[PDB]
């Protein structure tokens with residue numbers, strides 16, 4: 001069942017979401033960029049084909065649904081998402097909200113104006129497509145800027161009006177989740193509607209269990225990110241960090257071992273094009289992780305099983321938690 | 330004729346440009362914004378109708394051509410420009426380049442990459458439309474940021490490869506034109522291919538004649554901008570300044586009186602929608618200047634005539650200078 005989630009191909013039953021990656025991208029870009037300069041990615045056709053191959057690989061590994069958390073300012077192209085979703089037979093949930101690169105036409109807006117924008121994308125549809133967002137993505141990088149405070153409040157308001165969940169980018173090492181939580185709660189948003197993302201970028205379990213104890217979903221969503229072996233590459237070092245995937249994966253077990261199995265969401269933060277960072281970062285990433293969005297089911301899940309995590313628990317994390325999170329509530 | 334300029338409706342003879350406003354906008358926005366949130370402007374249809382009425386008014390006052398200097402990051406919508414150009418029977422020259430709000434997908438690019446982007450828009454067409462840019466717009470606001478240095482170099486390179494002119498946003502009070510000139514000349518660009526814009530935002534004739542003596546076009550392009558009478562409106566004060574239109578217009582006469590009649594370009598920097606600033610700034614502007622893009626021919630040109638500027642000189646400034654500037658050279 002009955003409960004429904006909006007995808008780029010229309011409504012689906014919550015129970016058909018199945019194994020769901022909750023923080024992913026088809027393409028990390030900027031508003032209007034794919035339209036104005038598709039050759040940056042070879043071509044739009046090349047980008048789409050690459051995404052379809054990647055999604056088919058994830059599907060073969062058991063992934064049924066991804067949540068593409070690309071906002072307006074990540075250059076979300078909902079037609080692209082629909083095309084690749086259809087071709088790969090993988091459900092894609094699209095996002096509204098704002099990441100940390102909003103243009104002036106967004107930065108000048110009030111909380112009321114931002115709320116109306118997020119509601120448009122959830123309730124009416126994105127652009128002129130009728131495709132509705134199933135999640136609201138927001139971001140801080142350290143202490144929230146004044147504008148980011150408005151974005152988080154607008155996200156809370158839009159979530160409260162629609163039941164659609166909120167998911168966040170954090171600077172995990174700066175413990176952004178604490179302020180994000182304070183702002184969301186100041187708007188009366190339930191922690192169960194919120195995922196504090198990039199939380200596997202830190203090993204601070206005091207911070208992570210603090211959030212989980214409050215009922216937040218903890219997004220351990222950068223599983224394959226490691227610059228181990230690439231320390232000479234400064235841009236890769238800065239973005240990927242120096243912790244292994246096994247170290248990140250251990251956080252899943254750490255939270256389960258501390259009673260928080262129902263508070264965990266697991267993902268890759270992968271993409272098939274990436275224009276908002278250094279040129280050729282996509283080639284570096286594809287070398288680090290050729291499995292792409294199949295990495296979680298192929299490497300992380302078996303690692304956890306071998307460490308003694310029961311299959312029912314792993315099913316709970318990868319199927320039940322996303323279903324509960326995405327189901328408008 | 331023989332010489333041709335690209336417009337949003339295709340090629341036109343340079344000699345048909347006629348009375349040309351060289352720094353104008355249909356809509357001041359952000360990449361992807363009109364597509365994602367047209368209701369911000371009432372609707373796309375309302376925006377277009379308003380622009381057509383405004384352009385018809387300018388046309389009735391003798392304006393034949395405007396140069397819409399909206400870049401990618403000003404949210405240039407070339408289909409919108411074509412629609413309103415066709416309906417109003419006013420030629421519109423579109424722009425490539427970058428203003429001061431580029432997203433990360435632009436900010437991360439090298440001079441070589443930016444050059445390729447500007448050349449795409451000039452030589453191939455904007456997005457998938459085949460509409461070609463006839464000018465390159467760039468911006469500093471004080472000393473150039475490192476990225477802005479690259480943008481100015483890329484603009485110079487694209488201009489050199491295509492003959493298409495470069496036009497700039499400055500913070501005039503900070504005399505940005507001097508550094509902009511230094512950067513352009515460092516790339517071997519001819520000053521005659523360059524307009525240093527917003528130059529009527531200052532009365533520093535040492536600065537202005539310094540540029541004109543070097544062969545730069547001096548863009549006196551904010552003619553109707555004044556917050557006189559609106560001093561209680563902080564956002565209007567900051568954007569419009571406290572100098573009268575007559576004070577701005579006097580700069581046209583000052584430069585003519587100093588032998589620089591052939592170095593002057595005159596415009597309004599007007600628009601019919603404006604999302605990159607405070608909400609309702611468009612209503613404030615329409616109250617200050619209901620004549621819109623007819624203000625120059627209706628008010629400025631007669632003011633100059635009454636101050637003794639001969640009609641042939643005024644024709645030279647409003648017709649001959651833009652023709653020479655826009656003609657690829």
Ligand SMILES: CCOP(=O)(OCC)Oc1ccc(OC)cc1
Pocket residue numbers: 025028029070074099169239269276277433
């Ligand atoms: C790689 C993961 O990034 P994210 O999920 O982006 C996809 C939308 O949240 C970058 C980080 C820093 C940058 O430089 C300022 C640019 C992009």
Ligand SMILES: CCOP(=O)(OCC)Oc1ccc(OC)cc1
Pocket residue numbers: 104354357358399403428498568598605606
């Ligand atoms: C009004 C004239 O602006 P411009 O021609 O813009 C149209 C593209 O070159 C604004 C100035 C400051 C702002 O705040 C940071 C926003 C817009």
Ligand SMILES: [Co+2]
Pocket residue numbers: 168169170198
């Ligand atoms: Co992020």
Ligand SMILES: [Co+2]
Pocket residue numbers: 023024025069269
């Ligand atoms: Co992400």
Ligand SMILES: [Co+2]
Pocket residue numbers: 497498499527
């Ligand atoms: Co400007």
Ligand SMILES: [Co+2]
Pocket residue numbers: 352353354398598
């Ligand atoms: Co302008």
